[PDB]
Design a protein around this ligand. Structure first.
Ligand SMILES: O=C(c1cc(-c2cc3c(cc2C(=O)N2Cc4ccccc4C[C@H]2CN2CCOCC2)OCO3)n2c1CCCC2)N(c1ccccc1)c1ccc(O)cc1
Length: 515
């Protein structure tokens, strides 16, 4: 149970929590409501665990992308700000905190990648990607290089890939279409081709990661880099006099980095939702409230119009907001993990020369489509198991695979009914060890090999954990178990299924039994 009468606030350690504590002290001074700010390690995983049992803080601070999964599992309360308060923030920041047509958090700050340049080696930064090769040829004559940024994570290379038309997921009617991916299209191919062309022309090295690029710019060895506000403090202490400006354009079109919006969500189980609403609207989201946090650790660009216009006097903050306005809001669905996993391998394989740009992106398009299909198999099965025990979950010829799989699971549960009853009763299920308990059992099931019988047991165990989660008043755990089953399907079971005739072969083997 969360204590009523006080506000407990969680925010990451790399933020200005001491400045946020000042706002809480001012709130406590005016109203007597005690405000406690904490920065637990790995709070992005710690919050859904404590919130799954109705515990945890009253207010959670994190990027908006994780709040979609939080809201789907019912961890966040719907905020109800008046129209006069919503006008005080930029409209696109409210779009980042809207899930299923409901606002689930208050926007605080805006964060996106920018072009960081060395003002000594490069007084006037290039406005286009195309003039970077010629810029590198002149710098190589002095022992320097033009650009060095992280090529191992697709978050840093995506603004160039998305510039000519690449997109992660299509957005229609307030919902992301996870089957409409845009890594295969010509815009993404043209952007990734230019990146690989830079590597082929020796302007960049395919092995450059975050640390190599940061160490290169912070020592004056390269003239430019691509990073966010989190890296400004390392360059401040260094001898490099750096500037921050808009990302270079590609084919006359702006680079489109993904925008992360630091947001404050209200715990759905908190008994102080009104006090939290009053604190966030009338104390934090003010010029004085944001200044106290920004003085401690800079927030970059902020969602509050009045204070953003003040922070924009520093050109590095205006450049952060400009690149965010030209980019795209990070999709707030857990299905982005499959997108990043596919695009990362596509960029890695294309840069090293193992595959062409066309093949690497086609493999990424099919990998994203396969992740959506495996998610469909998991969620249809879990929804059937939960409905069997009377629990609804919010999340005939074409359904032959789904109908055969659930009957095979029912046959497995019926054959070992007594064994399932003992296991389900004696199961050690907590939100803090559920993932480890799941991964341990799945390792045992497939240690001596993968077969269709063990896959049926794999699905049936995930259904048992979901049923036990709802029985033990931990229903938000069902959404996490479904994601764990989908991730193991995509990463480990998918190749065996493909090499053994696909799910059509499963129907042909188990189908005859069901007559
Ligand atoms: O530890 C397990 C478990 C279940 C099976 C298993 C998988 C199969 C199968 C068979 C069994 C199996 O061996 N059992 C089925 C079963 C079902 C439900 C509860 C317990 C058990 C234990 C035994 C039953 N014994 C041996 C056979 O004769 C009857 C007595 O046929 C095709 O696929 N296996 C393991 C561990 C690795 C070997 C195979 N769970 C587990 C997990 C946590 C805690 C305890 C057991 C587990 C994993 C997935 C599940 O869907 C269900 C159980």
């Amino acid at each position: 149970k969360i204590e009523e009468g006080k506000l407990v606030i969680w925010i990451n350690g790399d933020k200005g929590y001491n400045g946020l504590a000042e706002v809480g002290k001012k709130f406590e001074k005016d109203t007597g409501i005690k405000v406690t700010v904490e920065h637990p390690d790995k709070l992005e995983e710690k919050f859904p665990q404590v919130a799954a049992t109705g515990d945890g803080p009253d207010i959670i601070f994190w990027a908006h992308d994780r709040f979609g999964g939080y809201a789907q599992s019912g961890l966040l309360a719907e905020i109800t700000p008046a129209a006069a308060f919503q006008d005080k923030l930029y409209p696109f920041t409210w779009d980042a905190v809207r899930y299923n047509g409901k606002l689930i958090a208050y926007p605080i700050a805006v964060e996106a990648l920018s072009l960081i340049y060395n003002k000594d080696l490069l007084p006037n930064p290039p406005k286009t990607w195309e003039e970077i090769p010629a810029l590198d040829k002149e710098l190589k004559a002095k022992g320097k290089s033009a650009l060095m940024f992280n090529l191992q994570e697709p978050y840093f290379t995506w603004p160039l890939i998305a510039a000519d038309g690449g997109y992660a997921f299509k957005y229609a009617a307030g919902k992301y279409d996870i089957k409409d991916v845009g890594v295969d299209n010509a815009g993404a191919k043209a952007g990734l081709t230019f990146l690989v062309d830079l590597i082929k022309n020796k302007h960049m090295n395919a092995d450059t990661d975050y640390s190599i690029a940061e160490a290169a710019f912070n020592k004056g060895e390269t003239a430019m880099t691509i990073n966010g506000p989190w890296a400004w403090s390392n360059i401040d202490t260094s001898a490099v006099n750096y500037g921050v400006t808009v990302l270079p354009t590609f084919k006359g079109q702006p680079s489109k980095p993904f925008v992360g919006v630091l947001s404050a969500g209200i715990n759905a189980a908190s008994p102080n939702k009104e006090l939290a609403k009053e604190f966030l609207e009338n104390y934090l989201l003010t010029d004085e409230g944001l200044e106290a946090v920004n003085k401690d650790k800079p927030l970059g660009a902020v969602a509050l119009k009045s204070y953003e216009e003040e922070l924009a006097k520093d050109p590095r903050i205006a450049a952060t907001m400009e690149n965010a306005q030209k980019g795209e809001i990070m999709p707030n669905i857990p299905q982005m993990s499959a997108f990043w996993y596919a695009v990362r391998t596509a960029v890695i394989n294309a840069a090293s020369g193992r595959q062409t740009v066309d093949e690497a992106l086609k493999d990424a398009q099919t990998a994203a489509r396969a992740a959506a299909d495996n998610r469909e198999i998991v969620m249809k099965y879990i929804h059937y198991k939960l409905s069997q025990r009377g629990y609804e979950w919010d999340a005939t010829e074409s359904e032959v695979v789904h109908l055969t799989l659930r009957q095979a699971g029912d046959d497995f549960s019926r054959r070992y009914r007594r064994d399932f009853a003992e296991m389900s009763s004696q199961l050690h299920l907590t939100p803090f060890t559920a993932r480890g308990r799941f991964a341990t059992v799945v390792e045992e099931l497939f240690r001596d090999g993968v077969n269709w019988g063990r896959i049926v047991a794999f699905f049936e165990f995930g259904g048992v954990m979901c049923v036990e989660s709802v029985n033990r008043e931990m229903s938000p755990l069902v959404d996490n178990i479904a994601l764990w089953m989908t991730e193991y399907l995509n990463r480990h079971l998918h190749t065996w299924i493909q090499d053994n005739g696909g799910w059509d072969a499963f129907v042909e083997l188990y189908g005859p039994s069901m007559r």
